[PDB]
Amino acid sequence: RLKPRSIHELSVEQQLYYKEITEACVGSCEAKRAEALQSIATDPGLYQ
Amino acid sequence: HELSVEQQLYYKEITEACVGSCEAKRAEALQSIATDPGLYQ
Amino acid sequence: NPADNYHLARRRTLQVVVSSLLTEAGFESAEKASVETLTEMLQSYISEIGRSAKSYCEHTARTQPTLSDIVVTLVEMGFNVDTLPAYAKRSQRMVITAPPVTNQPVTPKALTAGQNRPHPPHIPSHFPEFPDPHTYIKTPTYREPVSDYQVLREKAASQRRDVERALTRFMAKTGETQSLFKDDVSTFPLIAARPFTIPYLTALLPSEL
Amino acid sequence: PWYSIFPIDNEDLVYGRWEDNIIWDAQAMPRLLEPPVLTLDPNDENLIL
């Protein structure tokens, strides 16, 4: 008996979004930071 | 999935060393469990 | 609250107008109920030339009222219109400022720019675009599988070597031990020989069958 | 991201109510417990199969 291969609780669009927002929030470019900061400030689905 | 005879024997000796026949074999079994590298599986 | 400010921006402008008209050759420090009375008669007066001069022009098949529709509207309210050029040229005449605008910034939003997805052919292009993936897109995801024969051979080999080393060190430490060299129990311990009572039986017989 | 950079967590620990296997009173135990079969989860690496 093998338990089923589980899936991460984030989608790959959500995981890609997390990667883009974190790589923008380390501030290589300032306009990228500022949008990523506004995206953090008003994304409704940023829970989970 | 099934334990190979090596680790089946290791499981048997380590579990029966911690049932209470003597204290020295128990201390060496607990010092085996605490300080071995490959006890996964 | 911008909901009641739709009405209170223009009714509290009419309160400054009555407060500016009761000061011109007149009062200071009026009663409170006497100001909300007079600014209620002022709003009801502008709303009555609104409804009646529109009615007098639309009776004459027109849509916007001229001067001849208001000088008949004010006659039907008993105004004596001829005294109005003398009232307009006062030296006490004052101007009350218009109310402020809620959207002072006008355009203060950086916004959030996200585009994904197109339109199915029953939705034309002028409807808003479909939103991003996080809003409604879910795919399961799994852990990275290591199907490599080299690292699987290495893992099985090292685990077998480590478990047999652990087993032989445990059995040499908890029994009689030998040492090829001098007083050597920590490094290279040998399980001591045991003359058994089952010789050929432990040699020749197979154990896995 | 082809694969997650965070290892898939134990779904049983993260989600299951393992608290229901705690035995608060031996005599008066609310849920009758059953023998557990070995399940050999393959999500864990370091296991050949």
From Swiss-Prot, chain A:
Query: Which residues are connected by disulfide bridges in this protein?
Result: none
Localisation per UniProt entry: Nucleus
What is its quaternary makeup? Answer: Component of the TFIID basal transcription factor complex, composed of TATA-box-binding protein TBP, and a number of TBP-associated factors (TAFs), including TAF1, TAF2, TAF3, TAF4, TAF5, TAF6, TAF7, TAF8, TAF9, TAF10, TAF11, TAF12 and TAF13. Interacts directly with TBP, TAF1/TAFII250, TAF9/TAFII31 and TAF12/TAFII20. The TAF6/TAFII70-TAF9/TAFII31 heterodimer forms an octamer complex with the TAF4B/TFII105-TAF12/TFIID20 heterodimer.
Q: Which family does it belong to?
A: Belongs to the TAF6 family.
- Phosphothreonine occurs at T42
Pathology noted in the entry: Alazami-Yuan syndrome: An autosomal recessive syndrome reminiscent of Cornelia de Lange syndrome and characterized by delayed psychomotor development with intellectual disability, hypotonia, microcephaly, short stature, poor speech, and dysmorphic features.
Summary of the function given for this chain in its UniProt record: The TFIID basal transcription factor complex plays a major role in the initiation of RNA polymerase II (Pol II)-dependent transcription. TFIID recognizes and binds promoters with or without a TATA box via its subunit TBP, a TATA-box-binding protein, and promotes assembly of the pre-initiation complex (PIC). The TFIID complex consists of TBP and TBP-associated factors (TAFs), including TAF1, TAF2, TAF3, TAF4, TAF5, TAF6, TAF7, TAF8, TAF9, TAF10, TAF11, TAF12 and TAF13. The TFIID complex structure can be divided into 3 modules TFIID-A, TFIID-B, and TFIID-C.
Q: What is this protein called?
A: Transcription initiation factor TFIID subunit 6
As stated in the Swiss-Prot or TrEMBL entry, residues carrying the post-translational modification Phosphotyrosine are Y47
Swiss-Prot record, chain C:
User: What keywords were assigned to this record?
Assistant: Acetylation, Cytoplasm, Developmental protein, Differentiation, Intellectual disability, Nucleus, Phosphoprotein, Transcription, Transcription regulation
Give the GO terms filed under biological process for this record.
cell differentiation; DNA-templated transcription open complex formation; inner cell mass cell proliferation; maintenance of protein location in nucleus; mRNA transcription by RNA polymerase II; positive regulation of transcription initiation by RNA polymerase II; regulation of fat cell differentiation; RNA polymerase II preinitiation complex assembly
The conditions that induce or repress this protein are given as: Induced with triglyceride accumulation.
Q: Which domain of life is it from?
A: Eukaryota
Keyword Acetylation listed? The answer is yes
Histone-fold domain sequence ranges? 12-79
Question: What cellular-component terms does GO give this entry?
Answer: nucleoplasm; nucleus; perinuclear region of cytoplasm; transcription factor TFIID complex
Coarse class of the primary localization is: nucleus
Q: Give one GO term, molecular function aspect.
A: RNA polymerase II general transcription initiation factor activity
- Phosphothreonine is found on T107
Where does it localize?
Nucleus; Cytoplasm
Quaternary state and interactors: Component of the TFIID basal transcription factor complex, composed of TATA-box-binding protein TBP, and a number of TBP-associated factors (TAFs), including TAF1, TAF2, TAF3, TAF4, TAF5, TAF6, TAF7, TAF8, TAF9, TAF10, TAF11, TAF12 and TAF13. Interacts with TBP, TAF1, TAF6, TAF10, TAF11 and TAF13. Component also of a small TAF complex (SMAT) containing TAF8, TAF10 and SUPT7L. Forms a heterodimer with TAF10. Interaction with TAF10 is mediated mainly via its histone fold domain while interaction with SUPT7L is via its C-terminal region.
Similarity field: Belongs to the TAF8 family.
Let me see what the UniProt entry remarks about domains: Ectopic expression of the histone fold domain acts as a dominant-negative mutant resulting in differentiation inhibition.
Quote additional remarks: 'Taube nuss' means 'empty nut' in German.
Task: State the name under which the record lists this protein.
Answer: Transcription initiation factor TFIID subunit 8
From Swiss-Prot, chain D:
Its domain of life? Eukaryota
State where the protein is found. Answer: Nucleus
User: What does the UniProt PTM comment say about this protein?
Assistant: Phosphorylated by casein kinase II in vitro.
- Outline what the protein does: The TFIID basal transcription factor complex plays a major role in the initiation of RNA polymerase II (Pol II)-dependent transcription. TFIID recognizes and binds promoters with or without a TATA box via its subunit TBP, a TATA-box-binding protein, and promotes assembly of the pre-initiation complex (PIC). The TFIID complex consists of TBP and TBP-associated factors (TAFs), including TAF1, TAF2, TAF3, TAF4, TAF5, TAF6, TAF7, TAF8, TAF9, TAF10, TAF11, TAF12 and TAF13. TAF1 is the largest component and core scaffold of the TFIID complex, involved in nucleating complex assembly.
What note about domains is in the entry?
Answer: The Bromo domain mediates interaction with histones that have acetylated lysine residues at specific positions. The second domain also recognizes and binds histones that are butyrylated and crotonylated.
| Similarity-based family | Belongs to the TAF1 family.
* Subunit annotation: Component of the TFIID basal transcription factor complex, composed of TATA-box-binding protein TBP, and a number of TBP-associated factors (TAFs), including TAF1, TAF2, TAF3, TAF4, TAF5, TAF6, TAF7, TAF8, TAF9, TAF10, TAF11, TAF12 and TAF13. Interacts with TAF7; the interaction is direct. TAF1, when part of the TFIID complex, interacts with C-terminus of TP53. (Microbial infection) Interacts with SV40 Large T antigen.
Q: What is this protein called?
A: Transcription initiation factor TFIID subunit 1
Gene name, Swiss-Prot/TrEMBL: TAF1
